[PDB]
Amino acid sequence: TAGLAVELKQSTAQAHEKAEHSTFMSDLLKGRLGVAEFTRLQEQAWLFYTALEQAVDAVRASGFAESLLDPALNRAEVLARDLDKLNGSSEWRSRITASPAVIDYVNRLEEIRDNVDGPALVAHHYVRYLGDLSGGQVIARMMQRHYGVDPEALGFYHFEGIAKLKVYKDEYREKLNNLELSDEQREHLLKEATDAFVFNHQVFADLGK
Numbered sequence: 001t002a003g004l005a006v007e008l009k010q011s012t013a014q015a016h017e018k019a020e021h022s023t024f025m026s027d028l029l030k031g032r033l034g035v036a037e038f039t040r041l042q043e044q045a046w047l048f049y050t051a052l053e054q055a056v057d058a059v060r061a062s063g064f065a066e067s068l069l070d071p072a073l074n075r076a077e078v079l080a081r082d083l084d085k086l087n088g089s090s091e092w093r094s095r096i097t098a099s100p101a102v103i104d105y106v107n108r109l110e111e112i113r114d115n116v117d118g119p120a121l122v123a124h125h126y127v128r129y130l131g132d133l134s135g136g137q138v139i140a141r142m143m144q145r146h147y148g149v150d151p152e153a154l155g156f157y158h159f160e161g162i163a164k165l166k167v168y169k170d171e172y173r174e175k176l177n178n179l180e181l182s183d184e185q186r187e188h189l190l191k192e193a194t195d196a197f198v199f200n201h202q203v204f205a206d207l208g209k
């Protein structure tokens, strides 16, 4: 009754809370881990953001949700640069492999990409990017504070090209509210958003293992 942004927040609350409270992310943010574990996180993130951004490109090209799917949000190329700094060479590209959790997540993104499934893609976009815009400074700050990570290796969290960030998040939520969705597409979107948090929790679980 209060618009899609509010409903997404409320519908995904249980899954979001489960993901935010994983042991791996909890130890990472409290300073118990190290730049190594942060680097492993960012390597798995590079795999699933590469897949997410293929799916966003296909959806944007179909004409669905275009103003929401701002290409300034793309993280994959920035993440690779970060991983070039963190690993000290481009060695990582040919070494990293998807964890099982990341295989399932990437598979789902690739299904969404090739189905060109606009409402599913919007769900995954909200769960990753709005997250990144919202709590991302807190993650970048803890990485600098606990681990000494250089801010030039935290480009993923900087969002180059956005000046006023609170404004941008506000407009992102209004763009969600303004999306034209059938009841069926809206249900599909809400369910996919919860699945997105579930995938992310399992990514942190596999990292912890």
Ligand SMILES: C=CC1=C(C)/C(=C/c2[nH]c(/C=C3N=C(/C=C4\NC(=O)C(C)=C4C=C)C(C)=C\3CCC(=O)O)c(CCC(=O)O)c2C)NC1=O
Binding pocket: 005, 008, 009, 016, 019, 020, 021, 025, 029, 126, 127, 128, 130, 131, 132, 134, 135, 136, 138, 139, 197, 200, 201
């Ligand atoms: C898989 C984990 C995870 C993801 C994907 C995630 C996404 C995510 N984090 C959000 C907010 C937020 N997220 C954080 C914080 C964090 N977020 C973090 O991942 C970490 C590690 C912190 C550090 C405490 C804060 C402080 C907000 C503010 C809430 C808001 O603006 O609504 C939102 C905003 C929802 C909305 O405004 O309706 C999303 C989608 N949050 C998660 O926890």
